Amino acid sequence: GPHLLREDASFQRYGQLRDNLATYWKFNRKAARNVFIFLVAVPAGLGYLAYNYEGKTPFVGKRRTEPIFEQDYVPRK
Amino acid sequence: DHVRSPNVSFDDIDYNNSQDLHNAQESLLREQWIRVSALKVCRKALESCYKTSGPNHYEDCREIAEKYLNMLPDHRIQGFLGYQKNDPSK
Amino acid sequence: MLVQNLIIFNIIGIVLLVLLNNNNNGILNKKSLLTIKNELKLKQIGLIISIINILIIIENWIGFNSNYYGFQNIERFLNIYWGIDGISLLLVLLTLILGPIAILSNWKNLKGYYTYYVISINMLVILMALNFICLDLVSFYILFESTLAPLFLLIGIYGANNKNKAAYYVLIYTLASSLFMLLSIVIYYIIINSTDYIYINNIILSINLQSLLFIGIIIGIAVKTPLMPVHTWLPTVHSESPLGGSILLAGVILKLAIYGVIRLLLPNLSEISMMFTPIIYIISILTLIYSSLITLKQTDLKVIIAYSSISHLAVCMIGIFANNLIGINGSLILCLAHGFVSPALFILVGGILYDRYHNRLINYYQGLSTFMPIFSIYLVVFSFCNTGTPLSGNFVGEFLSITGAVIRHPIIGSLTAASVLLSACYQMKLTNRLTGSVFSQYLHITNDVTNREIFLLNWLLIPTIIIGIYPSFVTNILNLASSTLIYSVLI
Amino acid sequence: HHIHTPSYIKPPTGGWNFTPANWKQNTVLVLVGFTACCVGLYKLGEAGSYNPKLKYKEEELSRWNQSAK
Amino acid sequence: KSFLPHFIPKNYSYGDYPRLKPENLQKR
Amino acid sequence: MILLCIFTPFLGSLISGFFGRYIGVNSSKWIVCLSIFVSVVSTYILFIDVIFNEIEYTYNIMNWLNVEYLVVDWSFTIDKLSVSMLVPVVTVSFLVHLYSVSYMSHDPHQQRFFSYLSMFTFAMIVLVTGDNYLILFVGWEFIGVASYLLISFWFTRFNAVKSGLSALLINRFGDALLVLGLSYLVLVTGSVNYNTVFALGSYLDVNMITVILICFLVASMAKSAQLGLHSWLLLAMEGPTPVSSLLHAACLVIAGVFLLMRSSPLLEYTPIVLLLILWLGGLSTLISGLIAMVSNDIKKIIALSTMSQVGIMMIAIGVSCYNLALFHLICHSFFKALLFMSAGSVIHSIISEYQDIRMYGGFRQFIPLAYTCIFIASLSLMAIPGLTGFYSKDIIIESMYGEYTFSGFIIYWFALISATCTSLYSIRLIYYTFLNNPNSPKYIYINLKENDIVLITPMIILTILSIFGGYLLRDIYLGMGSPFNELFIHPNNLSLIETEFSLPSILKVLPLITGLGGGLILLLIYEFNYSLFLVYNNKNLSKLYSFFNQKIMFDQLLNNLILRSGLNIGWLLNVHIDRGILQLFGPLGLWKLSTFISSKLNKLVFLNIGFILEIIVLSWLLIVFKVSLLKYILLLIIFIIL
Ligand SMILES: CCCCCCCCCCCCCCCCCC(=O)OC[C@H](COP(=O)(O)OCCN)OC(=O)CCCCCCCCCCCCCCCCC
Ligand SMILES: CCCCCCCCCCCCCCCCCC(=O)OC[C@H](COP(=O)(O)OCCN)OC(=O)CCCCCCCCCCCCCCCCC
Ligand SMILES: CCCCCCCCCCCC(=O)OC[C@H](COP(=O)(O)OCC[N+](C)(C)C)OC(=O)CCCCCCCCCCC
Ligand SMILES: CCCCCCCCCCCC(=O)OC[C@H](COP(=O)(O)OCC[N+](C)(C)C)OC(=O)CCCCCCCCCCC
Ligand SMILES: CCCCCCCCCCCC(=O)OC[C@H](COP(=O)(O)OCC[N+](C)(C)C)OC(=O)CCCCCCCCCCC
């Protein structure tokens, strides 16, 4: 239309780069460290929490079978 | 009018009968929704007993609360697939 | 009656628009009379056709029994059995309601070829709507993949600068993954000789075979919701597709994956679904958390909304794999609530700002409330709907989905509550910037929201709040249909 | 004073010190409107509200506990 | 005196994109 | 009558929101003030019926959630706890709206301001009157929504915009924990209704009770600005002063206290959570007062006082003295709203509109009415005997020693220091603003005049409430044996009697001696020996001054470490996962693989007799070779592709 936006070359260069980060990504040691953490380490941690407590938490209408308050008091002196 | 549950068990039918398996599936669903209706009625009694009794609610509503805590685990919809596809006695 | 009329009427509509607009191609070089005002008459006929499709499902809704167990309106057409239940009925109506909205959102922002676009929109809507009423696996797959042909051409013709990248992504990500789902369907037809819903629901397969069939189907479903790590197609497709394509993609196409779980996994592979639920929960939880943190760093307005959709559909996946009525109903309500809010956010971000400034970079926009107050009201209102603020259908969907996960798995299902915090982090970071500070120095003052764009925003907001305040309009229909999906043997 | 650009920015809340010329006329209509269904709130509230501590007698509750026992 | 925030790389390489010292604009 | 108390402020919000363009600036403000006043008179009528006659009201609009056993209704019930909470909310809201009529008279956007202010009032009424937790959560969220719009009201100011986001996101962090507690409540009890859940408190597992209330405790910290989630509280000063007078007195900062007092039938059956509430309250009382003694913005000093007093309510809840916490909650809303109102009076009166007490001085004569309101409100805050703060705060501090536990003894000293620091920062604020030598230009003092009567009127009304109010209402909440069954106290936890009879008389006046004696010593140093407060000389004093002036360096630690690393994780996921490995195992990686393979195959299509004859004869080896060698031929072929 009437070009209602004042196009900024530095904005366009910056925006074009942010869309195209994949071109310059290298699977170096730094990238490998983050890939292992996000896609192997953390899923394993949640993986072991999910199956450890699979059916081990019957928490529907769970009852209290033990007293909360002490009957007798014993001084510290 | 008010339709009724065609009481039909999986244990008394041939699954190759398409209409009979449909009734047993519906029959199990309708009995579970009634238990949900009964549980809500019991919870209604608990709420009215708690409001009226005030500080007496621990003693006055003791058996109503005990019954609600017992019915809560199993007075919920369980589906028909679990019992249709499993034989408990084997 | 439903399927037969919904197909015959739309074919007559497709042929009618072709006959009128192509009668003058033969070196006439004329000026015609339907080409005036950007093919106004041809646009109006297609707009009317979309509304009439909503009237057809209504005639079958009046006779729908919410207290009947099983499929209703059972019909045979093209040697295929078609039927509807409570779950299917609501998804069909959601699909058809978005039809007029998709056409009206692109009423005057196409460079040309309006007849082609309107036909493709009405063609996409019917194929998706028919996918909820088929009653066998093969018919599900036929309608699941038939949408790729018009969607591929819709993006490549009417798309943005990177439309070529987006057209290839949608065609290859979805077709390759669905072929794995076809492998499982072929196995069902080989060992059982039928793909009928009711026939296969009663058969128990060996636990090893159920694992292979589940993985084949879940590959097709996981790509189309989408879930991590096969989600990379969606942000690229949403940023380049036309506004109507984004509305249908964000409103209907993603909901077919949840309906795939309801039909292709829960009633037939019930035993193996319980085994896979921890894996499903881990994948979905990380899909929710990762997509929310990634959304923070995005710089494209239409990509931010695209990543917001992935976070909420992870919550829908979590709810539908809960083995209780609370989670299943919560996932379905969240699907419908998302089906209105997400298209609205694309209209605000990629239909109003883009039609005025033709730039989706975040750095150009701030302080819009100074000269666009009406836009800011709708932007702020839909932002709080998108984060599950109460009184919105999103919250009712989100709260029941989170509750259903907690009941299903108290330990790991509690991580689903991060949707409450993380969704507000990236959504209110974008909204606080568009409505904050001085009106941007890179923008010229122009018109505010027009009557057409007000109309689109109002009729996507209204269903969200009606469902949010009184969801029993939806839960009454879903109650008996959802209760059949639960698998448990309590002794 | 300043320049408020009121030619085209007319939000529902007013936009920089907006008081229309016929504000007295509209104020009476809104005050009538506010008062009219403010009584409607009162009429609805008196009909719909109830005391939850007087709906059931204490004798009715004793039977409930024993029957549910 | 004035120091950059954390997680700000001291170098980067993104093809022909200009390379510049990171300036926290909040301190201007 | 019940529908009038709840929804009338919501109608005032709509009128100034959508009809502000049509009724103008003047009539929009007063019609909204009319809607709040209707809620005031309705609340007072209900207060007599509920508290004095034991009558409960309940209006059930319709069903909200009806998913199997989970049934949630749009019901609002008014009982002793709910109607008591409406007394500070609706009264202070009315006196803040009436205050805002003249305070905001120079603001170009006044219809929007009174729309947000009344919408905030409606949300708080919804929170305290809902019959179940979900209805409370609706008010809980929309309080955060309205606080976000009020703090960022001057949205052209970059600071106000980022402060509104900061308040919203920290509270949304609390909301995420509150939702989890409600999900766990449905899991364990099947309900969110108060009537159902509170009847089961004794029979439920302790761990289940602890999980739910730990989630409630985290949500309480965010809204009440307890330690850990208190950073947004001082950023909230970016909003207009009427917002501060409302949010920090009878509103959002007190929502966390209400959530814990409502849950008392459950909260009494988990000592571990009560212990955490005790310590978290004790730490925040000590830290707030220490920061407030070296703070220089007048609104920040009062804001830190609000955080200190809310922590006084938390320690009372920790020792299961819910009745004291509710009473101190009501009294604090009166004299803290007054302090914010009288602070905004001084800021408007000075023609430079400074907010820094270092630029004040010698104001007592020129604005004597503003000084009197601050003086009485400070004395009420300082729990001077005979005043309303004395009947609510002295008993809470003494209850820490009346516990006779290890934690109670530690928190007593923390409360005692906070009580002493309260006198110190009150005298310091009064000296710098009123009693110091003039630091402002001479032109300021010839123009320093009191504001109009509309600003003055609410301050006078709150001034009287800060003198007598506590004495009148003391017996309702603090009387021994007074029935308040909404606030459940377990018989094992009653300590009101040993608090009242067993404490030494030295401790009965110890907070009074340190505050009055310490305050006088501080006042003398400023007037006569100010050379001791040139702390820039000593390097250790400068570092100790800088540590508290920067608020225990918490805001720096939060932004520079937690928020920076939270955003960097998204960047690492964006770079190394979404644009990284998922492209290598995606389009970009497969494009390179396809180009490499297709380039090899393009070299094998050329018209040559020898080439095709060799391949034909080579294939004959498949007939000769035994079939077990097929996979070795397959491996050999992949080698040749390379
Ligand atoms: C920005 C977008 C613009 C839209 C914004 C506003 C959206 C519209 C707001 C209303 C939303 C629609 C929901 C109401 C539709 C009516 C629902 C209904 O059917 O109520 C039925 C109810 C009980 O049903 P029943 O006993 O069976 O008797 C009727 C038999 N047909 O029978 C009844 O008792 C009817 C009671 C109706 C009460 C009025 C409902 C209006 C909303 C007020 C209450 C909202 C909840 C309170 C929230 C306050 C804040 C916490
Ligand atoms: C979550 C999403 C999941 C979906 C993703 C699924 C795809 C996963 C597979 C990823 C592997 C491909 C991606 C990485 C390949 C990159 C290829 C490449 O870079 O070329 C490597 C090398 C040529 O070297 P060059 O590229 O010029 O420079 C080195 C750069 N470091 O040349 C090479 O070394 C390439 C190796 C030679 C070709 C080996 C061929 C093996 C057989 C074909 C593999 C596919 C088999 C398909 C079989 C059915 C086909 C009909
Ligand atoms: C429900 C099942 C329906 C099946 C029938 C499909 C439509 C047939 C159209 C033929 C007539 C034609 O090519 O006409 C062309 C028309 C209208 O173009 P126009 O703008 O007038 O052309 C320009 C003329 N000017 C310059 C004078 C204005 O394009 C359409 O209709 C497009 C619809 C098909 C797109 C998707 C193709 C997918 C193929 C695989 C499907 C699984
Ligand atoms: C519980 C649900 C409550 C519903 C009713 C509440 C009142 C509605 C007020 C509408 C009018 C209004 O505020 O929007 C219009 C005003 C306009 O600004 P102005 O003051 O006229 O100044 C005009 C001068 N400009 C142009 C510089 C601003 O705001 C804005 O565009 C400011 C941007 C923020 C949008 C606020 C939306 C709030 C929605 C609440 C989300 C839940
Ligand atoms: C099985 C689990 C689910 C996976 C679903 C399918 C995902 C496939 C990957 C996306 C490819 C795509 O979209 O192809 C489109 C891309 C477009 O690339 P571009 O962005 O334009 O860059 C390329 C140009 N440059 C670098 C110059 C800018 O063409 C290609 O790269 C061509 C290679 C095609 C390989 C397709 C094989 C598919 C196999 C699927 C099963 C392994």
Automatic annotation (TrEMBL), chain B:
GO molecular function: oxidoreductase activity
E.C. designation(s): 1.6.5.3
Compartments (UniProt record): Mitochondrion inner membrane
Keywords: Electron transport, Membrane, Mitochondrion, Mitochondrion inner membrane, Oxidoreductase, Respiratory chain, Transport, Ubiquinone
Signal peptide coordinates: none
Any one annotated GO CC term: mitochondrial inner membrane
Main location per the UniProt record: mitochondrion
Record membrane topology: Peripheral membrane protein
Enzymatic class: oxidoreductase
Keyword Calcium assigned: no
Domain of life (superkingdom): Eukaryota
Protein's UniProt name: NIDM (PDSW) subunit of mitochondrial NADH:ubiquinone oxidoreductase (Complex I)
Gene expressing this chain: nidm
Automatic annotation (TrEMBL), chain C:
Location(s) in or outside the cell: Membrane; Mitochondrion membrane
InterPro entries, per the entry: NADH_Q_OxRdtase_chainM/4, NADH_UbQ_OxRdtase, ND/Mrp_TM
Pfam families: Proton_antipo_M (PF00361)
Top-rank taxon: Eukaryota
Transmembrane segments: 6-24, 45-64, 80-102, 114-133, 139-160, 167-191, 197-223, 243-266, 272-291, 303-322, 328-353, 365-385, 405-426, 454-473
Keywords: Electron transport, Membrane, Mitochondrion, NAD, Oxidoreductase, Respiratory chain, Transmembrane, Transmembrane helix, Transport, Ubiquinone
One cellular component (GO) term of this entry: mitochondrial membrane
Keyword field contains NAD: yes
Biological processes, Gene Ontology terms: ATP synthesis coupled electron transport; electron transport coupled proton transport
Gene Ontology MF annotations: NADH dehydrogenase (ubiquinone) activity; NADH dehydrogenase activity; ubiquinone binding
Keyword NAD: yes
Catalytic activity: a ubiquinone + NADH + 5 H(+)(in) = a ubiquinol + NAD(+) + 4 H(+)(out)
Membrane topology: Multi-pass membrane protein
EC number(s) on file: 7.1.1.2
Chain ranges of the NADH:quinone oxidoreductase/Mrp antiporter transmembrane domain: 136-416
Purpose of the protein: Core subunit of the mitochondrial membrane respiratory chain NADH dehydrogenase (Complex I) which catalyzes electron transfer from NADH through the respiratory chain, using ubiquinone as an electron acceptor. Essential for the catalytic activity and assembly of complex I.
Family from the record: Belongs to the complex I subunit 4 family.
Entry protein name: NADH-ubiquinone oxidoreductase chain 4
UniProtKB/TrEMBL annotation, chain D:
Enzyme class: oxidoreductase
GO MF term list: oxidoreductase activity
Gene: nuum
Biological source species: Komagataella pastoris (Yeast)
Record keyword Oxidoreductase present: yes
Keywords: Oxidoreductase, Ubiquinone
Top-level taxonomy: Eukaryota, Fungi, Dikarya, Ascomycota, Saccharomycotina
Record-listed E.C. numbers: 1.6.5.3
Protein name (record): NUUM subunit of mitochondrial NADH:ubiquinone oxidoreductase (Complex I)
From TrEMBL, chain E:
Top-level taxonomic group: Eukaryota
Annotated signal sequence range: none
Protein name: NIAM (ASHI) subunit of mitochondrial NADH:ubiquinone oxidoreductase (Complex I)
Organism: Komagataella pastoris (Yeast)
Residues of the full protein shown: 25 to 52 of 156
